[PDB]
Design a protein around this ligand. Structure first.
Ligand code: SF4
Ligand code: SF4
Ligand code: FES
Ligand SMILES: [Zn+2]
Lengths: 208, 95, 126, 82, 114, 48, 688
C-alpha cells in the first residue's frame, strides 16, 4: 500500500483528461475514443481519414507542440473488420507529456503516409510496409527493409509461422546458395500456459 | 558395472543397448561409446537404513538449501520401508 | 471516393506467398478448447481457436527428436466469434471444419434434495 | 446388367418428398414383399433432395430426382429402373 | 464495401499497368542476364517471366492486381540495381531438384503424404 | 587445496581423463532411449 | 413465476429457486473458487473455500449449497471475502507435503492455481505436517494417501454412481484417512475415472505415472473406440507420438467419463503394431517386402479372380473411408460379398428400414423415460456410460427398469422377468406383474442387446420386440412422439456397415466359400482356412495382428483410429470423426489410400483422390454422414413390422446367457487389451 504499490498521480491525470477532452471537442470530425489508463498516458483513437490533419494539429496549435515521434506500429490483431493498428507515440519538448495516436485500418485500404510532416517516419513507413502490408499512398520510396530481397510474405503476421517457408543451404553442384522447404531439427514444443480460475476479475467483458 | 551385450560392448543403465544390425554401431566406429560405470541402483544396496524412534519423520538431505525440501514420511507398516521420494533412501522405526 | 462494391470474397492467398500445398491441403479446424477436466474452471473457454491438421514427425537420426517438415503445425489463431472465423478463413483462402460450442446445461441441485424422507438419494456417510 | 441395388434419399419437408412420403405410406410393402432379394435402401439425415438412384450394371449409378414429382412418376421411374 | 482504390478505377488500367510491367520485364531480361553472368539462355528467362505472369490468372480485384504490379515494380527496381544478386535470380529458377512428385502412386510409395 | 585435503565422497574419478577433442577417444552422442513402437514379430513356424 | 432477482455486484439477473449462488454467478460470468463442489456430482458444503459476502450480512455463507431467496446482492470483490479466502487458503496448505515436482498433476493442479490467484504468500506453522501411509487401491490407480485434502469428491462419486461402496473415511479430526478400511483392492468399472475427479494429485494413474508433464503436450480431438457411444475424448499427444488421453464433455452423451479399458488402452495401441507389407515365402514363411512387389502380386491376382467368390470381412475397427473404398473396388471388379464379423440376422428386411437396427431413442433421453425394460445383454460391460446414465436417471427421476433374458451383475436394483425369451413372448402375449404397468404405462423404452444375437433365434425375438413396440406405442393413450425398442451393439463399424446397407454376417461366406477375401480387422474366430476351398488367398489388412496374422497370406499394415481422419458412428446414428493425431509408425498407410493404390496397380481406377472427394462420394452414397453431431431419428415402425411377419420360428429352449459375465472377461476380450501389458497386469492382479 504505502510500500510496494506504485503510487498513482492525480493532477497529471486530471490535466491529461482535460487535454483529451479538449482535443476531442475541438476536432469533431476525427474522434472516436479518448482514454486514460492508470499510469496516465493519453490515448486518442482515430478513423483513418484525417491522419495528416491530426498530426499537423498535434505538431502546432501552440498549446501542444509534440515534436518527437515514435514507432508508427500497425499492431496486428485478428477477428476484426480492421486488423491493423497504426500507433503513433508522441513526446513534447516544452511540456513533458506523452500521447498515443492510434488510428485503425484493414489489410488493403491505404493511409496518407505522414512522412511529409514528420521526416522521421520515412524509414519507419518503409519498414512497416515490408513487415505488415499497410500500403502508403503519397510516399517517395517503398523498398524492403529488415527482410531478404527474394523473401516475401510480410512475416510479422499471425499467418506466417515462427519458422519460415524458406531455408537456405549451400551446394557445390551449382556452387551457390539454394533455398529449400524448411526442415527443423527440433519440434519447438509449444507450452500450454493458459491458466484457469479468473486471472483478472475486473476485466470481464459481458458474456455472450 | 557394465554388462555384456552380444555385440561385445558395454550396455547402458537403461535398456537402449543396440541390436546386432544397427548402423548406429557403425557410426560408433573407432571412438569411445562413453558410459558412466557408476550406476544409480548400485549405491542403494549399500545403504544402512536407519532406525528412528518416532512415528512420522523428516528428511532434508544434509542441511537446508543443500539438498531437497522437507519431506515427511511415515513408519506405520513394518512390511514396507519408508522410501523418500527425493533422497532415494529408506527409513525404519523400532520400539 | 465512393468506389463500386462487389459481392466477392478477398484474395490475399497469392499476396502472402505461402506455397501451394500449404495453401490447399491444410484443412483447418475451428474449435472451442473445452474445459481441461483434470483442472476445474472454464476460464480457458470463450476463445475460438483456429488450428491446423497435424502431419508426420519422424525420428531425428542422431537424437530421436521429432524433426518435422511443417511450417503450419504450431499456429493458433485466437478469435472471439464464429462469423469472423468464417470471414478470416474465406479471406486468407483455405478450408475448414467447425465444432460447436457446448455449454454446460445447468441442473437443479440442493443439499435439501440430497436428503429426503421418501426419495432414493441417500449419501449415508455425511 | 444385373439389377443390383436401388437407393432412395429422403428428408422431412419438400413437396416431391411429401409425394414420396405418400409413397412410403401407401406403396412400399408391395416392393420388398414382392422382391425378397432386391435390396433397395432408404437414407435420411435431415434435409436432402429425394434422390432416386440405382447402382447396377457394374458400377453404373443411374440418377433421377423427385423434387415436386408425383407418386405415379415414382412408380414410373421405379418400373423404368426395374 | 465502397473501398478506396489504389491505382485503377476498373480492370482497364489494371490490365494496362500489368502489361506495362510485362513490357518492362521483357526489355529487362537481356541487360541483367548479360550483366550478372548467368548460365541460362535469354529465352528461358523470358519464358519463366511469362510463366510467373501465367501463374496469377485467377486474380480479380483491382486492389490486388495493382498490388501485384507494385511488387513487380519494386522487384524490377531491385533488379535494375544490383541490390539483389545471382543467388536471388537463380532462386527464381528452380534448378536444384527437388523432383518431388504428384502421382498418387508416387505419393503412395514415397508416402505419408496426401 | 593443501589447506583442506580430505572430503568424504566416494564416487569421483581419480584418473582424470583430460581434454580430448581431437583424438580417437572422445564423445559421441546417442539417445538414452529404448524402442518406441516395437514392431510385430513374424511367426517362427511356417504354414502350408 | 420462478424468476428471482439477485444482484451480482449491483447487476440484476433472474434465477430459478433451488439453484444456488454459484449457478447465478456462472450465469453472469463469475466463478467462485471451490473444491468439494463439482458441476456434475453431488453437493455438500465440505471444503469451505466458496465463502462469499452478501450486502447487509454479518454471517459469511458457503455459496455452493445455498437456496436462493428473492432479491439478493452478492459481493465477489469485497474485503472480508478476500480475507476469508486467504485465511482458508493458509489453512489448506499446512498438511500438504512438498511434492509439487514429484506430483503427477503439477501442470494441472487446483491448489496451485487457487493459491496463486486467491492465496497469501508468507506462510506460518513452522513445525508439524504429519504424513499418512498409502496402500494400493488397485494395479491401475497409483495411490498416495498423503496429498489428500480430504475434499470428499471421490467418496460421494462412488456412493452415488459406482455402487461398490468400499471407500469411506476413518478416524476423526486431524487423523482422518480416506479410502479402504479392509485393504481390499478396487477393480470395478470406471475405476480409471477417479484421476479426473481427484482435484489434487492424490489418486493418479499407475501406467501413465511418470511419462509426461501437462505443459508439454498438445491436444487433439478424438472419438471413443471399442464402444458404441463415443465420448468427446482428447488425445493429449506428445513428441511425435501420444503419451496421454483424457475425456471431454458432450451435450447429450457421455458426460465426464470414459471406459477404464479405453483410458488405459493406449499402450496396446502402441505395442505390437503391423508395420510392413508382407508376403508368404517359398518354404511357407511370412516375410516382409516393399509395397511394390507385394501390391503388384495382389493386384494381378485380383485381375485373375472374378465372380461371387471374392469376399471382404470388415470386422472390428474399420473406417467410413475403408468401407466406401472397399465397396467401390469390389463393385468395380465384377460383384461382391461384403461381410461383417458379428452376424446381424435379417428375416423381415433388416438391412434397410433404418429404425430397426439402431438405438432409436435419445441417450440423454433415458432421463426422460419412465418404463425401461432390458432384453438380454450386460450393459455394465457393453457401453458402460450407457449404464451409468441409466443409474443416474434411476437415482434422480426413478426409472422403472426390467431385465429379461439372464440374471447378470448390474447394480441398481432391477426388476427381473423369468430369464428366457419364451417368457419374453409370454410378456408380449400374456400378462405379468411388470406387463400391467408396461402396457398401461406412459413412457416405453426397450433396450435390446446384441450378445445373444449371433444365434439363429433373431427373427422371432426381433418380432416380439416389434410386437411390444407397436402394441404399447399404439396403446397407453398415445399416438407416439416418444420411443421404445432401442437396440445397441458393440462395434461402431457394424452400425456403419448397416447404414451403408451391407450383406450382414458371414452367411454368404458359409454359403459360397470364396476364392479371394480381404480380412479387414479379423481377430475373432470367424473363418478357418480348412473350412475354405483350395483357393486359400486372403489379404489380411490390420494392426497388431495376434489371431489370424500367422494364418494369413498377404499382410497389409493398416492404420488405427488415432492415425486417420475417419468418420465413425455411435449406436444412435450420430456421425463423429477423428483427426490425424500421429502419422502411423512403420510404413503403414491409411485404408482408403491402400485400396485406391490397389485399384491403381490393378487394371482399373477409382474416381477420387482427396478427402473432399471422399466425402462428396460419401454423401452420394448416403446423406447421414456429412451432418456431423446432428441426431438422426428414423420412423416407420408399422412398415418394419408388416415386413417382419414373413418367417417365424419356434424358439430355442435354452435361456440366454452373456459371455460378458465378469471384469476379467471384459478386459481380455478385445485386441488392444489382448496386446497391452498393463491389462494383463490388472487381470493377474484381479486373480492374484
Ligand atoms: S496436488 Fe499437491 S503436490 Fe500436487 S501440484 Fe497440487 S499442491 Fe503440489
Ligand atoms: S482422494 Fe482426492 S477426491 Fe478423494 S477426498 Fe481425497 S482429495 Fe478428494
Ligand atoms: S464448494 Fe461450497 S464448501 Fe466446498
Ligand atoms: Zn528426502
Amino acid at each position: 500500500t504505502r510500500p510496494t504499490v506504485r503510487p498513482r498521480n492525480d493532477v497529471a491525470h486530471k490535466q491529461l483528461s482535460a487535454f483529451g477532452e479538449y482535443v476531442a471537442e475541438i476536432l469533431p470530425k476525427y474522434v472516436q475514443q479518448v482514454q486514460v489508463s492508470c499510469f496516465s498516458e493519453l490515448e486518442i483513437c482515430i478513423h483513418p481519414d484525417g491522419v495528416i490533419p491530426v498530426l499537423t494539429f498535434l505538431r502546432d496549435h501552440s498549446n501542444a507542440q509534440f515534436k518527437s515521434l515514435a514507432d508508427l506500429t500497425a499492431v496486428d490483431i485478428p477477428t476484426r473488420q480492421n486488423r491493423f493498428e497504426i500507433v503513433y507515440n508522441l513526446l513534447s519538448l516544452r511540456f513533458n507529456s506523452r500521447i498515443r495516436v492510434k488510428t485503425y485500418t484493414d489489410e488493403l485500404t491505404p493511409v496518407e503516409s505522414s512522412v511529409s510532416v514528420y521526416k522521421a517516419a520515412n524509414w519507419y513507413e518503409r519498414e512497416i510496409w515490408d513487415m505488415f502490408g499497410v500500403f502508403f499512398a503519397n510516399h517517395p520510396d517503398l523498398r524492403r527493409i529488415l527482410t531478404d530481397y527474394g523473401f516475401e510474405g510480410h512475416p510479422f503476421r499471425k499467418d506466417f509461422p515462427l519458422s519460415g517457408y524458406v531455408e537456405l543451404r549451400y551446394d557445390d553442384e551449382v556452387k551457390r546458395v539454394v533455398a529449400e522447404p524448411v526442415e527443423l531439427a527440433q519440434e519447438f514444443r509449444k507450452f500450454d500456459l493458459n491458466s484457469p480460475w479468473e486471472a483478472f476479475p475486473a476485466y470481464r467483458q459481458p458474456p455472450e | 558395472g557394465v554388462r555384456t551385450s552380444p555385440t561385445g560392448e558395454k550396455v547402458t543403465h537403461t535398456g537402449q543397448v543396440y541390436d546386432d544390425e544397427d548402423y548406429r554401431r557403425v557410426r560408433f566406429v573407432g571412438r569411445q561409446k562413453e558410459v558412466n560405470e557408476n550406476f544409480a541402483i548400485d549405491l542403494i544396496a549399500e545403504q544402512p537404513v536407519s532406525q528412528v524412534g518416532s512415528r512420522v519423520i523428516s528428511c532434508d538431505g544434509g542441511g537446508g538449501a543443500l539438498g531437497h525440501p522437507r519431506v515427511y514420511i511415515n513408519l506405520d507398516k513394518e512390511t514396507k520401508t519408508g522410501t523418500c521420494g527425493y533422497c532415494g533412501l529408506q527409513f525404519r522405526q523400532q520400539h | 471516393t465512393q468506389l463500386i462494391t462487389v459481392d466477392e470474397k478477398l484474395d490475399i492467398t497469392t499476396l502472402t506467398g505461402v506455397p501451394e500445398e500449404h495453401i490447399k491441403t491444410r484443412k483447418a479446424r475451428i474449435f472451442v478448447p473445452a474445459r481441461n477436466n483434470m483442472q476445474s474452471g472454464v476460464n480457458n473457454t470463450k476463445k475460438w481457436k483456429m488450428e491446423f491438421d497435424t502431419r508426420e514427425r519422424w525420428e531425428n537420426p542422431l537424437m530421436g527428436w521429432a524433426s518435422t517438415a511443417d511450417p503450419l503445425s504450431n499456429l493458433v489463431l485466437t478469435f472471439s466469434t464464429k462469423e469472423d472465423a468464417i470471414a478470416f478463413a474465406e479471406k486468407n483462402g483455405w478450408s475448414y471444419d467447425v465444432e460447436e460450442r457446448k455449454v454446460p446445461k445447468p441442473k437443479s441441485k440442493s443439499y435439501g434434495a440430497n436428503f429426503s424422507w421418501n426419495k432414493r438419494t441417500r449419501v449415508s456417510t455425511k | 446388367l444385373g439389377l443390383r441395388e436401388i437407393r432412395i434419399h429422403l428428408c422431412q419437408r419438400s413437396p416431391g418428398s411429401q409425394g414420396v412420403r405418400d409413397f412410403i405410406e401407401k406403396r412400399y410393402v408391395e416392393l420388398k414383399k414382392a422382391n425378397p432379394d432386391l435390396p433397395i435402401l432408404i437414407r435420411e439425415c435431415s434435409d436432402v433432395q429425394p434422390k432416386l438412384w440405382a447402382r447396377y450394371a457394374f458400377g453404373q449409378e443411374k440418377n433421377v430426382s423427385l423434387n415436386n414429382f408425383s407418386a405415379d412418376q415414382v412408380t414410373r421411374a421405379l418400373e423404368n429402373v426395374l | 464495401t465502397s473501398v478506396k482504390p489504389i491505382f485503377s478505377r476498373d480492370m482497364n488500367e489494371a490490365k494496362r499497368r500489368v502489361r506495362e510491367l510485362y513490357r518492362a520485364w521483357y526489355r529487362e531480361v537481356p541487360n541483367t542476364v548479360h550483366l550478372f553472368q548467368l548460365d541460362i539462355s535469354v529465352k528461358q528467362g523470358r519464358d519463366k517471366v511469362r510463366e510467373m505472369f501465367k501463374k496469377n490468372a485467377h486474380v480479380t480485384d483491382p486492389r490486388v492486381v495493382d498490388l501485384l504490379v507494385i511488387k513487380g515494380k519494386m522487384e524490377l527496381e531491385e533488379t535494375i540495381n544490383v541490390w539483389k544478386q545471382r543467388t536471388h535470380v537463380m532462386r527464381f529458377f528452380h534448378e536444384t531438384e527437388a523432383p518431388r512428385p504428384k502421382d498418387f502412386l508416387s505419393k503412395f510409395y514415397v508416402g505419408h503424404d496426401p | 587445496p593443501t589447506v583442506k585435503p580430505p572430503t568424504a565422497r566416494k564416487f569421483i574419478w581419480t584418473n582424470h581423463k583430460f581434454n580430448l577433442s581431437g583424438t580417437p577417444q572422445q564423445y559421441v552422442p546417442y539417445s538414452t532411449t529404448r524402442k518406441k513402437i516395437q514392431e510385430w514379430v513374424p511367426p517362427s513356424t511356417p504354414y502350408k | 413465476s420462478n424468476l428471482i432477482e439477485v444482484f451480482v455486484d449491483g447487476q440484476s439477473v433472474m434465477v430459478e429457486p433451488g439453484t444456488t449462488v454459484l449457478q447465478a454467478c456462472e450465469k453472469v460470468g463469475m466463478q467462485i473458487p471451490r473444491f468439494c463442489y463439482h458441476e456434475r456430482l453431488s453437493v455438500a458444503g465440505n471444503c469451505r473455500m466458496c465463502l462469499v459476502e452478501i450486502e447487509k450480512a454479518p454471517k459469511v455463507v458457503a455459496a455452493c449449497a445455498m437456496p436462493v431467496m428473492k432479491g439478493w446482492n452478492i459481493l465477489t470483490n469485497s474485503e472480508k471475502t478476500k480475507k476469508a479466502r486467504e485465511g482458508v487458503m493458509e489453512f489448506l496448505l499446512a498438511n500438504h507435503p512438498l511434492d509439487c515436482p514429484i506430483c503427477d498433476q503439477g501442470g494441472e493442479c487446483d491448489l496451485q492455481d487457487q493459491s496463486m490467484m486467491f492465496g497469501s504468500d508468507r506462510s506460518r506453522f513452522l513445525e508439524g505436517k504429519r504424513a499418512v501411509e498409502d496402500k494400493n487401491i488397485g494395479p491401475l490407480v497409483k495411490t498416495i494417501m498423503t496429498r489428500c485434502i480430504q475434499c470428499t469428491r471421490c467418496i460421494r462419486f462412488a456412493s452415488e454412481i459406482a455402487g461398490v461402496d468400499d471407500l469411506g473415511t476413518t478416524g476423526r479430526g486431524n487423523d482422518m484417512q480416506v479410502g479402504t478400511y479392509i485393504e481390499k483392492m478396487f477393480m470395478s468399472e470406471l475405476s480409471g475415472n477417479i484421476i479426473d475427479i481427484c482435484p489434487v494429485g492424490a489418486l493418479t494413474s499407475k501406467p501413465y505415472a511418470f511419462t509426461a508433464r501437462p505443459w508439454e503436450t498438445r491436444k487433439t480431438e478424438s472419438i471413443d473406440v471399442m464402444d458404441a457411444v463415443g465420448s468427446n475424448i482428447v488425445v493429449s499427444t506428445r513428441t511425435g507420438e501420444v503419451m496421454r488421453i483424457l475425456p471431454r464433455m458432450h451435450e447429450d452423451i457421455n458426460e465426464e467419463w470414459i471406459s477404464d479399458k479405453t483410458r488405459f488402452a493406449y499402450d496396446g495401441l502402441k505395442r505390437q503394431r503391423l508395420t510392413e507389407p508382407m508376403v508368404r515365402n517359398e518354404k511357407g514363411l511370412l516375410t516382409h517386402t516393399t509395397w511394390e512387389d507385394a501390391l503388384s502380386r495382389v493386384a494381378g491376382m485380383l485381375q485373375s479372380c472374378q465372380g461371387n467368390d471374392v469376399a471382404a470381412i470388415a470386422g472390428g475397427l474399420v473406417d467410413a473411408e475403408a468401407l466406401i473404398a472397399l465397396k467401390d473396388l469390389l463393385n468395380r471388379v465384377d460383384s461382391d460379398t461384403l461381410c461383417t464379423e458379428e452376424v446381424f440376422p435379417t428375416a423381415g428386411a433388416g438391412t434397410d428400414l433404418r429404425s430397426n437396427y439402431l438405438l432409436n431413442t435419445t441417450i440423454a433421453g433415458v432421463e426422460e423415460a419412465d418404463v425401461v425394460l432390458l432384453v438380454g445383454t450386460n450393459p455394465r460391460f457393453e457401453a458402460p456410460l450407457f449404464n451409468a446414465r441409466i443409474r443416474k436417471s434411476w437415482l434422480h427421476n426413478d426409472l422403472k427398469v426390467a431385465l429379461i433374458g439372464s440374471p447378470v451383475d448390474l447394480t441398481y436394483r432391477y426388476d427381473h422377468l423369468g430369464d428366457s425369451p419364451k417368457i419374453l413372448q409370454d410378456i408380449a402375449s400374456g400378462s405379468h406383474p411388470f406387463s400391467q404397468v408396461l402396457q398401461e404405462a406412459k413412457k416405453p423404452m426397450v433396450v435390446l442387446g446384441s450378445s445373444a444375437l449371433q444365434r439363429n433365434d433373431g427373427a422371432a425375438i426381433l418380432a416380439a420386440v416389434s410386437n411390444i413396440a407397436q402394441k404399447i406405442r399404439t396403446s397407453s393413450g398415445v399416438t407416439g412422439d416418444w420411443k421404445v425398442m432401442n437396440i445397441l451393439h458393440r462395434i461402431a463399424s457394424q452400425v456403419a456397415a448397416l447404414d451403408l446397407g451391407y450383406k450382414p454376417g458371414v452367411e454368404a461366406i458359409r454359403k459360397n466359400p470364396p476364392k479371394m477375401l480381404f480380412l479387414l480387422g479379423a481377430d475373432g474366430g470367424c473363418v478357418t482356412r480348412q473350412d475354405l476351398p483350395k483357393d486359400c488367398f486372403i489379404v489380411y489388412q490390420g494392426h497388431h495382428g495376434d489371431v489370424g496374422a500367422p494364418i494369413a497370406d498377404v499382410i497389409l499394415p493398416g492404420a488405427a483410429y488415432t492415425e486417420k481422419s475417419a468418420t465413425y458412428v455411435n449406436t444412435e446414428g450420430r456421425a463423429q470423426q477423428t483427426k490425424v493425431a500421429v502419422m502411423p509408425p512403420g510404413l503403414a498407410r491409411e485404408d482408403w489410400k491402400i485400396i485406391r493404390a490397389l485399384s491403381e496397380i490393378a487394371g482399373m481406377t477409382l474416381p477420387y483422390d482427396t478427402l473432399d472427394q471422399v466425402r462428396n462420394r460419401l454423401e452420394e452414397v448416403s446423406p447421414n454422414l456429412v451432418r456431423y453431431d446432428d441426431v438422426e431419428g428414423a420412423n416407420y415402425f408399422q412398415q418394419a413390422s408388416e415386413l417382419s411377419k414373413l418367417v417365424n420360428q419356434q424358439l430355442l429352449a435354452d435361456p440366454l446367457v452373456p459371455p460378458q459375465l465378469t471384469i476379467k472377461d471384459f478386459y481380455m476380450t478385445d485386441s488392444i487389451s489382448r496386446a497391452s501389458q498393463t491389462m494383463a497386469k490388472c487381470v493377474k492382479a484381479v486373480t492374484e
